[PDB]
Amino acid sequence: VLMDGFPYIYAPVDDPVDLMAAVNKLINSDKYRPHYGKVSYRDQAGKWVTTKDNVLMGPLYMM
């Protein structure tokens, strides 16, 4: 896990898990709550700005 930098997750189609119950657990957890803060980027005017809202960054499999 440390070398890869990511724990690979086995998620079978017939997994007996309540999805929104799992989401609620993660939000209310002191251990596994994902970082939820602002982000900074350079806009189309060339100015370095930071967002007012909290933005979450996550992975997606793209092809």
Partner 1 sequence: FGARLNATARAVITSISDPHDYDELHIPWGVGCQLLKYHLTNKLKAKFNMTTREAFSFVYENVLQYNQIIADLFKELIAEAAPYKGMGCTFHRNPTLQRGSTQQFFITKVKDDINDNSISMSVLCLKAPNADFDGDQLNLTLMPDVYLTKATERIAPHTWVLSIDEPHEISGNLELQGPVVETIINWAHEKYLPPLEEWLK
Partner 2 sequence: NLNRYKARDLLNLSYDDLWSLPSEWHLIEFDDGKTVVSVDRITKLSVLCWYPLKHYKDCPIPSDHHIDFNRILTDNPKDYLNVEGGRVTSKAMVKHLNKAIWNIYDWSGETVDPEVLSKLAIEGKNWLYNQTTVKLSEYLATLSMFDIAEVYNHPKVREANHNIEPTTYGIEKISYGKVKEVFNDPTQFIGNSIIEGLRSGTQKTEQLLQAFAWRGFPTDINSDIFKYPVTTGYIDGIWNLYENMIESRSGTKALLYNKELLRVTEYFNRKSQLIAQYVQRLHPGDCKTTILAEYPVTKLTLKAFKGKYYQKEDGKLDWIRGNETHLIGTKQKFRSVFGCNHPDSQGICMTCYGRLGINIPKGTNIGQVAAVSMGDKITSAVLSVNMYEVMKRFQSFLHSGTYLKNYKSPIEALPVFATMANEKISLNISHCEILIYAMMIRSAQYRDYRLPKPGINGQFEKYNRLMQCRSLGGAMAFEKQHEPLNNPGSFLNKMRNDHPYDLLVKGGKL
Residues making contact with partner 1 (CB under 8 A): 44-45, 53
CA distance 27 to 22: 9
Name the E strands within 1-63.
Answer: 40-42, 48-50
Q: Please say which residue, 12 or 46, places its beta carbon nearer to partner 1.
A: 46
* Residue written as token pair 């982000």: 39
Q: Determine if 29 is a binding residue for partner 2 (CB under 8 A).
A: no
Closest approach of partner 2 to the CB of residue 27, in Å: 6
From 56, 19, 50, select the one nearest 37 (Cα to Cα).
Answer: 56
List interacting residues with partner 2 (CB under 8 A): 14, 18-20, 23-24, 27, 36, 43-45, 47, 49-56, 58
